[PDB]
Design a binder for this molecule. Structure first.
Ligand SMILES: CCCCCCCCCCCCCCCCCC(=O)OC[C@H](COP(=O)([O-])OCC(O)COP(=O)([O-])OC[C@@H](COC(=O)CCCCCCCCCCCCCCCCC)OC(=O)CCCCCCCCCCCCCCCCC)OC(=O)CCCCCCCCCCCCCCCCC
Ligand SMILES: CCCCCCCCCCCCCCCCCC(=O)OC[C@H](COP(=O)([O-])OCC(O)COP(=O)([O-])OC[C@@H](COC(=O)CCCCCCCCCCCCCCCCC)OC(=O)CCCCCCCCCCCCCCCCC)OC(=O)CCCCCCCCCCCCCCCCC
Ligand code: BCL
Ligand SMILES: CC[C@H]1c2cc3[nH]c4c(c3C)C(=O)[C@H](C(=O)OC)c4c3nc(cc4[nH]c(cc(n2)[C@@H]1C)c(C(C)=O)c4C)[C@@H](C)[C@@H]3CCC(=O)OC/C=C(\C)CCC[C@H](C)CCC[C@H](C)CCCC(C)C
Ligand SMILES: CC[C@H]1c2cc3[nH]c4c(c3C)C(=O)[C@H](C(=O)OC)c4c3nc(cc4[nH]c(cc(n2)[C@@H]1C)c(C(C)=O)c4C)[C@@H](C)[C@@H]3CCC(=O)OC/C=C(\C)CCC[C@H](C)CCC[C@H](C)CCCC(C)C
Ligand SMILES: CC(C)=CCC/C(C)=C/CC/C(C)=C\CC/C(C)=C\CC/C(C)=C/CC/C(C)=C\CC/C(C)=C/CC/C(C)=C/CC1=C(C)C(=O)c2ccccc2C1=O
Ligand SMILES: CCCCCC/C=C\CCCCCCCCCC(=O)O[C@H](COC(=O)CCCCCCCCCCCCCCC)COP(=O)(O)OC[C@@H](O)CO
Ligand SMILES: COC(C)(C)C/C=C/C(C)=C/C=C/C(C)=C/C=C/C(C)=C/C=C\C=C(C)\C=C\C=C(C)\C=C\C=C(C)\C=C\CC(C)(C)OC
Ligand code: HEC
Ligand SMILES: CCCCCCCCCCCCO[C@@H]1O[C@H](CO)[C@@H](O[C@H]2O[C@H](CO)[C@@H](O)[C@H](O)[C@H]2O)[C@H](O)[C@H]1O
Ligand SMILES: CCCCCCCCCCCCCCCC(=O)O
Lengths: 277, 259, 63, 41, 313, 65, 318, 44
């Protein structure tokens, strides 16, 4: 329900669509109009995933093992048209439901932060992950030419899809945007570990000692590496790294196939064929 | 000493089960740490039961943790008791989960986006015991960076682009050199009010400050300081909350909806 | 062009356009010379003209 | 809105029209030569 | 950089992503480089026999004179069109053998006739066949031969590694750049993956998987395909989940080993020194010598069926 | 429509011209790219586009299920 | 539009801050701090000073020797041609001894230099860990950072030292190079049957994605409430203001549960450390108790099954 | 007609147009170089 200091903040208004029709709370959650739409999109998507598991790929390979349940996209011979329900149209319906649910979630966040009077950084950051998913299942299939290029919905089968797509270019480590995205991911993990460690160390000092001040935080990292970035700038940098990783991963996957159809090492030939050497 | 314990079990399976047990323990620990602020919850279940059933969920709360503050400022318990308050609003509808209406004049109501708790009434201190946020009239060793506007004498305009005063002084932070506040000399009451940087946009071309939170006529109700050289944690929160309330209560079209 | 074209410099300062043009033509010339060096028709060093007078051992025909 | 006088717009418009006309004439001549070299339609 | 869309061929189950992608412009340019040659008209059947008008015929003993001269005319076009017939035959007569080209060609005839009769599980699935033009393409010396690569120069006291150097033989990766010698000439194990879930006496090192990877990069570059043309990448060892082309490749490796060990090496005495590598071995045959970047030589053009002198019987 | 000039009483023209120019340029780029992808309307291939014919039993693409 | 606090509009310059005084028996800090204007638009515009003790000097010496050996071998691999060194720089590497030596010492050109470089680099890393511990303890702070660094060092040593000794050969170790060590990463997966089916690999990937998600959420949250003074996290921890309350309430309304201003930094700490812990185990189980991860997953009913639409005849089974 | 520049600033539009024209020219030249039909360096 409510935290002991929450009742001051449950005010009316700030909705995008609906007004007073859906302006209420359900337990701890705020629903609104987009809450209703997103919840029922998610419910239908879940029920269709369960039915697709019930039907199975055949009558012999059907199983309720959670690692082995997979719902697959259509064939490449259907192009961008609509496939029969049992032959890959269920995947398309579930994809539409998932997109609807994600957009509803983002809009509900926008409503919540309008109500609380805070900035809009959080839905803005969520839009990057939504865009990466959309590149995975919408932009790349259209550029390639068929819905069959999307990945299957299964816990272990989409790993098989990733592996085979990676080996279609004979060596995926030599993709340059892939290297940039991996560098950003590793750097983000390092920065998060350091931020957590420093805050906990300052807040929980040695025994029989008082809480440390803001000067200690800067002095520590100036004495380790000779530079300190600050309290606000560490959060700036964390957001920047986490979003750059996703942006460059989307770039790396959208150029594989649509814009390059050979092995990835060969792409570096422009460097090796310069007249300098 | 081999890799097969039985006909079906092996080492790499026992290792994953041990990891799952450790992970369950870690999740319980983290959720218990999460519950040091705002619990036990305030719900209908407690008040119907006459203050008998306390809503904490699972897991329950931890034993109190002690923070000791520097310069003999005192001691604070991480899980503590706080006095229940009477809000300045009134429910829109009697069913549970209904919103509240900000009774009175919404800007001067202390409810909704214009709400804040009551923090300690003492100034934040440096490593030597000085006040932390002070105007540049006492932090004389500070200076404005080169090739920068120096926003003294800039006119401040309200939400509707109407001038509401001029900047008189800049409040900076001794421990970390950066600007935390602007001082506006309102030309409607002959008073001076503080303005957080997070609510002001620097138009460096024409030398202006844009305040999109409240209108020009609203600069006459900003909460004031006790002394003209330092600020306390209470007053800073009050000043920020007053401007935050304008993000919803400024105009008739800001309550929504679009359709 | 128009006789009154000289007013253009009342909008653009000489320094920031002189630097840009001088830093631009050099890059363009380098790029064109490299593009010509890349082709087999307009490479003046390896064209075989005039004659070779350089003897050109077992070879590796995989490369 | 832009803080320009009337003549500060008139002279700019006149010189802009003259320069753009000359620039377009150049590219028209270039495209005529290119078409006389190798048609692309 | 390239622009979409590509031409896609699906090979596996939907959602498994076993597909081939081609750039149509690159495909058209590659097609322009692999056209076949229109065959000669059929000979008049009958007349004098070969074994009664010629002396030093050894390989083509069971033909007719018209077919014999037609075959000679065709192989003049396939191998040495610029030089003509004096390239192989000493001027003055035709029965003399005092030149190395005639001996080499006599061995090459047997190699081709063996290829067209003994390895039909490789070169006769669709009846494409093998002719002299498959390798030479009108040149006396084929364009895609290999020798034992010495690699970049090293200091006198430094032991070479054979890797960590950019090379087109492994498609510009930092893998061992000479996979020909241990696999396509000698007979080393290509399999490195174990076939049990738990350890049982499989002590293959991690450095041998890189040699296998280099050979596979060379193979896929020679055929112009990717890995999923023959494999499912979640189990490279599993024949049950592979494609029918993997069996053809398995037989092709043995066919190339046979060609190198039994037809090319014994000729190392009579070939001139300009046909040998720095180690003293001649030019050898690989996957690139016939396919030249296509999944079939000449994309499967059938010109061997018109010449009955290229079959053992 | 008779009194359409009132539409400029609600929308600022200075932003409207920027938006219209940007949208029109984006639409033109998209349509040109779509034509460039299509196999019928591709002028970069040249007026004298002659694809390679297959003389014998040859196929440019391998077979697939 | 509204100020998003992504860049600093107006900067303020105060004199340099030497730092909190150190206790007796410490060397003075070296260097005089200077200010950078463009660096001040995103963070603090002050660089230096630094503290350099004895452990810090030893780390520098050991690490520079190791890096010099690596570079010298990369240069020798192209026969002292500096231009060819620049051309092939990303492809060059120094590589471990051959598999026919086991755990013995080969000649210099055949893996001795690799062993010496690895030893010196490991020594420098250990000394740097000791330096971080000492600097944490000199100011009266706790030792969370040294524990996280210890986890990273554990994964590094599993990757380079412990597993080769368990397998009994140096050829199982990773080379020193840009493209060479990516080749090693690919060959390791190929040799041991599709590392996607290693469950500790799955856990490690989950924790990496979780670290990215947690840092994005925390950064966006703190930037959203920074108009209330939310960036000063210590004050909010010791005296909860509107920033912490609004940050908690946003997430409680969004997903039903929330953390604290103090507690969230614990979620950050454990998520990153568990990324490398589960990594170090995942490769210690590979080749020692599991031979083929795909067959292991089939044995435990994890790998999915597909309809048989393409298949091949086995030439070893005729 | 001579009233656009009251709405649009001239100084920035000059540099914007100058940059846009050069970017477009470079793009068209690169595209033409990538087509074997219109390449003027190796086609002849
Ligand atoms: C069967 C199932 C098995 C499991 C069954 C149980 C399941 C249920 C478990 C429920 C509890 C879950 C955990 C929650 C508890 C908790 O969070 O405590 C709060 C507590 C809160 O502390 P705080 O309030 O901040 O305290 C501040 C105080 O002022 C100061 O506090 P303090 O000093 O009193 O704290 C004590 C402190 C000890 O403090 C001291 O001793 C003094 C200062 C440190 C001196 C020693 C230096 C550190 C030693 C490392 C030296 C490195 C050398 C160079 C590098 C070598 C690398 C090999 O504890 C430690 O630091 C332990 C040393 C850890 C260092 C190494 C960790 C990373 C290396 C991992 C090695 C490989 C592991 C593979 C497995 O947090 C901790 O205590 C953290 C302890 C360290 C974290 C890591 C510990 C190991 C975790 C392993 C995870 C993987 C295990 C996988 C098992 C399953 C798979 C097989
Ligand atoms: C390798 C990792 C793999 C992870 C796999 C798993 C990942 C997915 C996990 C999914 C978890 C879903 C959680 C649902 C939360 C629902 C809200 C809630 O009440 O929370 C319960 C619980 C706290 O409950 P509480 O605040 O103590 O309860 C207050 C009173 O009990 C209040 O008492 P009461 O009388 O109100 O009690 C009733 C209680 C009912 O409680 C439950 O239903 C059970 C919840 C737990 C199951 O609360 C409700 O009333 C909920 C009503 C929901 C209505 C739903 C229908 C309308 C919603 C419309 C929304 C808009 C669309 O929150 C959690 O347990 C969160 C645990 C998070 C664990 C994450 C572990 C993995 C994280 C990744 C690792 C990253 C590195 C870490 C280092
Ligand atoms: C053989 C295979 C190749 C390879 C082939 C590929 C292929 C193919 C891909 C990658 C992709 C990635 N690879 Mg790779 N990659 C390889 C080796 C690596 C190695 C390594 C150590 O070797 C690393 C670190 C990586 C790392 C990466 C990342 C850069 C990237 C994945 C992150 C991402 O896309 O976020 C994206 C994040 C999302 C999509 C999250 C979306 C979630 C949204 C918000 C939906 C909500 C979720 C859910 C419904 C909510 C409810 C759930 C519960 C009910 C609560 N690869 C090998 C060499 N790699 C992927 C990529 O770049 O994608 C853009 C990709 O497609
Ligand atoms: C872009 C930077 C990183 C990021 C940011 C980010 N994620 C976010 C947010 C932000 C800022 C939120 O505010 C939002 C949130 O609420 O967090 C608590 C969220 C969120 N990120 C989530 C997950 C998530 N983020 C990921 C990644 C990332 N998120 C990036 C690394 C991943 C990865 C890498 O895999 C996952 C799994 C959720 C916990 C949450 C959004 C919840 C949501 O959208 O709920 C609405 C939908 C449902 C409740 C049900 C959907 C119904 C569908 C039918 C489900 C199945 C769809 C699917 C296509 C089929 C199955 C797929 C198979 C692979 C199994
Ligand atoms: C929680 C797991 C994550 C993690 C954590 C982590 N890393 C850490 C720490 C922690 C907690 C530290 O405390 C420690 C540190 O100091 O952080 C600031 C560190 C660190 N993590 C580092 C790197 C690093 N971490 C990585 C990853 C990760 N670190 C994980 C994702 C990676 C990856 C993904 O590959 C790298 C590369 C270092 C920057 C630092 C530890 C540095 C160290 O120990 O160095 C010892 C050796 C030397 C200093 C040798 C120097 C010798 C000479 C100075 C060389 C002279 C030549 C010179 C290089 C020429 C070029 C010019 C120079 C001027 C640059
Ligand atoms: C038996 C039965 C009912 C079966 C049904 C099963 C079915 C069908 C389930 C499907 C239900 C579907 C499809 C939809 C329902 C959706 C509903 C109602 C609820 C789902 C909510 C949801 C998606 C929760 C996911 C949350 C998860 C898993 C991860 C979030 C990331 C994470 C680990 C967060 C933990 C740490 C937290 C709380 C961070 C937030 C947080 C941050 C980031 C701060 O910076 C901060 C700063 C200062 C103070 C506080 C905070 C703070 O709390
Ligand atoms: C499993 C569920 C176990 C019981 C859960 C529970 O008991 O939660 C109940 C939810 O019931 C309700 O929404 C009942 C109405 C259900 C609404 C469902 C909405 C679906 C679409 C969103 C109680 O919540 P509230 O009445 O909002 O709060 C009561 C007070 O504290 C005021 O906050
Ligand atoms: C101007 O610059 C000069 C020329 C001076 C120097 C320049 C050098 C350059 C350009 C260097 C470039 C280096 C690069 C690109 C390095 C890349 C390194 C990478 C990517 C490394 C990645 C992984 C390597 C790992 C994980 C190796 C780990 C090895 C370990 C942990 C081995 C430990 C071995 C031990 C402890 C062995 C002990 C055995 C004994 C003690 C007997 O050995 C003597
Ligand atoms: C079809 C029946 C023929 C004929 C008439 C010839 N060849 Fe080949 N050939 C191949 C290779 C790798 C070599 C060695 C490289 C070389 O020596 O140039 C040869 C060599 C010859 C020669 C000798 C040419 C010379 O250098 O003097 C001659 C005269 C010759 N061939 C004739 C490879 C192949 C093939 C690939 C497997 C095939 C098929 C053929 N050759 C077929 C023929
Ligand atoms: C984290 C929870 C862990 C719980 C279990 C703890 C005990 C773990 C013990 C296993 C450690 C690995 O133990 C190692 O296994 C391998 C593989 O079987 C054994 O190898 C041996 O048995 C295998 C299998 O029959 C045969 O190839 C041969 O007999 C021999 O090589 C080694 O002799 C043993 O040293
Ligand atoms: C670093 C970025 C280099 C970009 C220029 C080189 C590659 C050009 C495109 C080649 C194709 O695609």
């Amino acid at each position: 329900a409510m935290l002991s200091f929450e009742r001051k903040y449950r005010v009316r208004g700030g909705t995008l669509i609906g007004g007073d029709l859906f302006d209420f709370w359900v337990g701890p959650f705020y629903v609104g109009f987009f809450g209703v739409t997103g919840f029922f999109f998610a419910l239908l998507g879940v029920l269709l995933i369960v039915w697709g598991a019930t039907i199975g790929p055949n009558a012999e390979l059907q199983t309720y093992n959670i690692w082995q349940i997979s719902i697959a996209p259509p064939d490449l011979s259907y192009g961008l048209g609509m496939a029969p329900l049992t032959e890959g149209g269920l995947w398309q319906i579930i994809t539409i439901c998932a997109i609807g649910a994600f957009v509803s979630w983002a809009l509900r966040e926008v409503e919540i932060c309008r109500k609380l009077g805070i900035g809009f950084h959080i839905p803005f950051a969520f839009a990057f992950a939504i865009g990466a998913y959309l590149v995975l299942v919408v932009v790349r299939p259209i550029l390639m030419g068929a819905w069959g290029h999307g990945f299957p919905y299964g816990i272990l089968s989409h790993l098989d899809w990733v592996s085979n797509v990676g080996y279609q270019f004979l060596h995926f480590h030599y993709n340059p945007a892939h290297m940039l995205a991996i560098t950003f991911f590793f750097t983000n993990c390092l920065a998060l570990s350091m931020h957590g460690s420093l805050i906990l160390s300052v807040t929980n000092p040695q025994k029989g000692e008082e809480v440390k001040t803001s000067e200690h935080e800067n002095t520590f990292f100036r004495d380790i590496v000779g530079y300190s970035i600050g309290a606000l700038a560490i959060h700036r940098l964390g957001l920047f790294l986490a979003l750059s990783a996703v942006f460059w991963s989307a770039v790396c996957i959208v150029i594989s196939g649509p814009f390059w159809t050979r092995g990835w090492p060969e792409w570096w030939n422009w460097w090796l064929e310069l007249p300098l050497w | 000493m081999s890799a097969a314990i039985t006909e079906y079990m092996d080492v790499a399976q026992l290792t994953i089960w041990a990891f799952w047990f450790f992970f369950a323990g870690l999740i319980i620990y983290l959720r218990r740490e999460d519950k040091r602020e705002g619990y036990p919850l305030d719900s209908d279940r407690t008040e119907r039961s006459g203050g008998r059933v306390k809503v904490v969920g699972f897991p329950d709360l931890a034993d109190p943790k002690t923070f000791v503050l520097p310069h003999n400022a005192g001691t604070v318990m991480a899980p503590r008791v706080e006095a229940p308050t009477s809000i300045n609003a009134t429910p829109v509808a009697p069913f549970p989960g209904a919103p509240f209406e900000p009774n009175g004049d919404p800007m001067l109501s202390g409810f909704g986006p214009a709400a804040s708790p009551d923090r300690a009434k003492h100034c934040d201190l440096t490593f030597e015991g000085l006040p932390k946020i002070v105007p540049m009239r006492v932090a004389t060793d500070f200076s404005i960076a080169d090739k920068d506007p120096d926003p003294r004498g800039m006119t401040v305009v309200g939400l509707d682009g109407e001038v509401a005063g001029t900047i008189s002084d800049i409040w900076v932070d001794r421990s970390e050199p950066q600007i935390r506040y602007l001082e506006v000399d309102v030309s409607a009451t002959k008073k001076k009010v503080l303005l957080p940087i997070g609510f002001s946009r620097f138009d460096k071309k024409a030398g202006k400050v844009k305040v999109a939170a409240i209108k020009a006529a609203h600069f006459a109700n900003v909460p004031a300081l006790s002394k003209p050289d330092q600020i306390t944690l209470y007053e800073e929160d009050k000043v920020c909350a007053y401007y935050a309330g304008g993000k919803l209560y400024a105009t008739a079209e800001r309550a929504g909806p679009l359709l | 062009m128009s006789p009154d074209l000289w007013k253009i410099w009342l909008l653009i300062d000489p320094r920031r356009v002189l630097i840009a043009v001088f830093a631009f033509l050099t890059i363009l010339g380098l790029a064109i010379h490299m593009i010509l060096l890349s082709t087999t028709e307009f490479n003046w060093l390896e064209d075989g003209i005039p004659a070779a007078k350089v003897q050109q051992t077992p070879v590796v025909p995989q490369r | 809105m832009t803080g320009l006088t009337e003549q500060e717009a008139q002279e700019f418009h006149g010189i802009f029209v003259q320069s753009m006309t000359a620039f377009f004439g150049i590219v028209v001549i270039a495209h005529i030569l290119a078409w006389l070299w190798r048609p692309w339609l | 950089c390239e622009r979409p869309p590509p031409e896609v061929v699906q090979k596996g189950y939907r959602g498994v992503a076993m597909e081939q992608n081609y750039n149509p412009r690159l495909l058209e340019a590659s097609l322009k480089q692999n056209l076949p040659v229109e065959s000669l008209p059929a000979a008049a059947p009958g007349g004098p026999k070969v074994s009664d008008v010629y002396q030093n015929v050894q390989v083509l003993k069971d033909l007719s004179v018209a077919e014999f001269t037609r075959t000679m005319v065709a192989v003049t076009t396939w191998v040495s069109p610029k030089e003509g017939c004096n390239y192989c035959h000493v001027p003055g007569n035709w029965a003399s053998d005092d030149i190395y080209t005639k001996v080499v060609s006599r061995r090459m005839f047997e190699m081709v006739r063996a290829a067209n009769s003994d390895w039909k599980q490789h070169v006769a699935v669709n009846g494409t066949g093998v002719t002299c033009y498959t390798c030479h393409r009108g040149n006396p010396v084929p364009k895609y031969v290999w020798v034992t690569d010495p690699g970049p120069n090293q200091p006198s006291g430094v032991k070479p590694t054979g890797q960590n150097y950019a090379s087109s033989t492994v498609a510009y990766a930092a893998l061992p750049f000479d996979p020909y010698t241990p696999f396509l000439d000698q007979t080393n194990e290509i399999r490195v993956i174990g076939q049990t879930a738990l350890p049982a006496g499989n002590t293959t090192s991690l450095k041998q998987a890189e040699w296998t990877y280099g050979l596979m990069m060379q193979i896929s570059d020679s055929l112009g395909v990717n890995c999923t043309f023959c494999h499912n990448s979640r189990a490279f060892y599993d024949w049950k989940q592979s494609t029918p082309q993997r069996t053809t490749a398995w037989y092709a490796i043995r066919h190339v080993r046979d060609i190198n060990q039994n037809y090319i090496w014994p000729l190392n005495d009579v070939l001139p020194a300009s046909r040998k590598g720095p180690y003293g071995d001649p030019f050898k045959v690989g996957c690139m010598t016939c396919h030249q970047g296509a999944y079939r030589p000449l994309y499967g053009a059938q010109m061997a069926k018109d010449y009955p002198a290229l079959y053992a019987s | 429509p008779q009194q359409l000039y009132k539409i400029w009483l609600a929308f600022d023209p200075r932003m409207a011209l920027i938006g219209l120019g940007a949208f029109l340029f984006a639409l033109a780029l998209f349509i040109h790219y779509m034509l460039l992808s299509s196999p019928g309307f591709d002028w970069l291939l040249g007026p004298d586009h002659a694809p390679v014919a297959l003389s014998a039993g040859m196929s440019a693409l391998p077979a697939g299920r | 539009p509204e100020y998003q606090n992504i860049f600093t509009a107006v900067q303020v310059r105060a004199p340099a801050y030497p730092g909190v005084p150190l206790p007796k028996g410490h060397l003075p800090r070296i260097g005089r701090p200077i200010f950078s204007y463009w660096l001040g638009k995103i963070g603090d515009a002050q660089i230096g000073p630094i503290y350099l003790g004895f452990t810090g000097t030893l780390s520098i010496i050991f690490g520079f020797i190791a890096i010099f050996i690596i570079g010298f071998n990369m240069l020798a691999s192209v026969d002292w041609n500096i231009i060819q060194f620049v051309k092939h720089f990303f492809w060059l590497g120094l590589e471990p001894p051959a598999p026919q030596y086991g755990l013995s010492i080969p000649p210099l050109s055949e893996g001795g230099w690799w062993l010496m470089a690895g030893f010196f680099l490991t020594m420098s890393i250990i000394l740097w860990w000791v330096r971080t511990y000492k600097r944490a303890e000199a100011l009266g702070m706790s030792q969370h950072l040294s524990w996280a660094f210890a986890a990273a060092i554990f994964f590094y040593l599993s990757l380079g030292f412990i597993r080769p000794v368990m397998m009994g050969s140096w050829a199982e170790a990773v080379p020193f190079g840009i493209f060479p060590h990516l080749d090693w990463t690919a060959a390791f997966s190929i040799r041991y049957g599709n590392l996607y089916y290693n469950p500790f690999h799955m856990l490690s990937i989950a924790f990496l994605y979780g670290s990215a998600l947690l840092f994005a959420m925390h950064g966006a949250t703190i930037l959203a409430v920074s108009r209330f003074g939310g960036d000063r996290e210590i004050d909010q921890i010791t005296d909860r203001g509107t920033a912490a309350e609004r940050a908690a309430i946003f997430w409680r309304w969004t997903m039903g549960f929330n953390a604290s201003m103090e507690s969230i930094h614990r979620w950050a700490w454990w998520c990153a450390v568990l990324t490398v812990i589960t990594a170090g185990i995942g490769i210690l189980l590979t080749g020692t108790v599991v031979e083929n991860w795909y067959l292991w997953a089939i044995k435990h009913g994890v790998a999915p099954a597909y309809p048989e639409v393409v298949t091949a005849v086995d030439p070893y089974a005729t | 007609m001579h009233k656009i520049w009251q709405i649009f600033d001239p100084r920035r539009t000059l540099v914007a147009l100058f940059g846009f024209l050069f970017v477009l020219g470079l793009l068209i030249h690169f595209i033409l170089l990538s087509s074997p039909a219109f390449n003027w360096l190796s086609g002849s």
